[PDB]
Amino acid sequence: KFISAEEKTGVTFDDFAGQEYIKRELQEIVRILKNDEEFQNKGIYCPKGVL
Amino acid sequence: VQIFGVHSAGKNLAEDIDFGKLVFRTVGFSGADIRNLVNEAAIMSVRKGRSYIYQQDIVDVLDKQLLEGMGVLLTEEEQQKCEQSVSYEKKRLLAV
């Protein structure tokens, strides 16, 4: 009973810069996850594990 | 080529797409790698607002993977300014 099932943490994308390519790639990943049906209409599938 | 056709059958391909002129760029690729390549081309197709996936999407995907392979993660603007930062003669030597 230790896993923090959080919803908000208070840290946004603007606080971390210098890797805007990584920010764009992570934005694409989370946008694919949230907007799944629109891109699965085109057959797009998200990666399951991001390291 | 057959695996590229099989794994990209359920996608909206353009008319200029032909994988026969990129077989030399995919030496050693497995079926999972070709599937990942097709998904990569689809993702950078929808990222640029494109409706279809031409050959240039696959070329850009392969080129960006090759650029990332030596550890270069740069967007267009920073690449342009860093190209402009270098002088002319010391670029002229690399040109020759």
Swiss-Prot record, chain A:
Mutant phenotype after disruption: Embryo defective. Impaired plastid biogenesis and thylakoid differentiation in embryo. Defects in the photosystem II protein complex formation.
Q: Which tissue types show expression of this protein?
A: Ubiquitous but preferentially expressed in young leaves.
Highest rank taxon of the organism:
Eukaryota
Locations listed in the record: Plastid, Chloroplast thylakoid membrane
Q: Which family does it belong to?
A: Belongs to the AAA ATPase family.
Subunit note? Homooligomer. Interacts with FtsHi2.
Function (record text): Functions in chloroplast biogenesis and chloroplast division. Required for plastid development during embryogenesis. Might be involved in chaperone functions or play a structural role in the thylakoid FtsH complex.
Q: This protein is called what?
A: Probable inactive ATP-dependent zinc metalloprotease FTSHI 4, chloroplastic
Q: What is the lineage of its organism?
A: Eukaryota, Viridiplantae, Streptophyta, Embryophyta, Tracheophyta
Q: Could you tell me the gene encoding this protein?
A: FTSHI4
Segment of the intact protein contained: 303 to 353 of 855
UniProtKB/Swiss-Prot annotation, chain B:
Q: What is known about its induction?
A: By high light.
Q: Where in the cell is it found?
A: Plastid, Chloroplast thylakoid membrane
Family the UniProt entry places it in: In the N-terminal section; belongs to the AAA ATPase family.
Q: What is the documented function of this protein?
A: Probable ATP-dependent zinc metallopeptidase.
- What is the name attached to this protein's record? ATP-dependent zinc metalloprotease FTSH 12, chloroplastic
Organism of derivation: Arabidopsis thaliana
Originating gene: FTSH12
* Full-length numbering of the shown residues: 673 to 768 of 1008
